[PDB]
């Protein structure tokens, strides 16, 4: 069902994350971590304190698709286990822990009806790394993804 998913997305904030390569998104999916540039790290730390759920929606540059979405489970922290990001290292901020909600892909062709008020109503696929996606557009975008039946949102609800 979609009921627990809708509950997780209630009053959430959404941010577009753009990765230059698939390798880093694969690492994030395997390890439950993400790191971004300091300008976006600051935005995400502020958002994490401000909302019940902060959702990162991932897109590998030039792939034509989103690769999934995840909920921040922490603010960024330093020192843990130098993640072997395939860089396109110090200019990177701290590490956020994330819980994946969906590891399935969504092609941009499926989101063409969704525009983001916070980016001049351009299609939601369009945006720099860290672009905030308004609540209604972000909710509808997440609901377009194929259900990920490997994920049990019960534990995610408990972190809220």
Curated annotation (Swiss-Prot):
Domain YTH: from-to ranges: 12-145
Phenotype when changing residue 18 to L: Does not affect ability to influence alternative splice site selection
Outcome of swapping residue 34 to A: Abolishes binding to N6-methyladenosine (m6A)-containing RNAs. Abolishes binding to m6A-containing mRNAs
Modified residues (Phosphoserine): 81
Effect of residue 128 to A: Reduced binding affinity for N6-methyladenosine (m6A)-containing RNAs by 100-fold
Consequence of substituting residue 85 to A: Abolishes binding to N6-methyladenosine (m6A)-containing RNAs. Abolishes binding to m6A-containing mRNAs
Residues binding RNA, per UniProt: 18-20, 34-35, 85, 129
Superkingdom field: Eukaryota
Record note on domains: The YTH domain mediates RNA-binding.
Quaternary organization: Interacts with SRSF1. Interacts with SRSF2. Interacts with SRSF3. Interacts with SRSF7. Interacts with SRSF10. Interacts with CPSF6. Interacts with KHDRBS1/SAM68. Interacts with TRA2B. Interacts with KHDRBS3. Interacts with EMD. Interacts with RBMX. Interacts with ZCCHC8.
Protein name in the entry: YTH domain-containing protein 1
Organism listed in the record: Homo sapiens
Residues of the full protein shown: 345 to 507 of 727
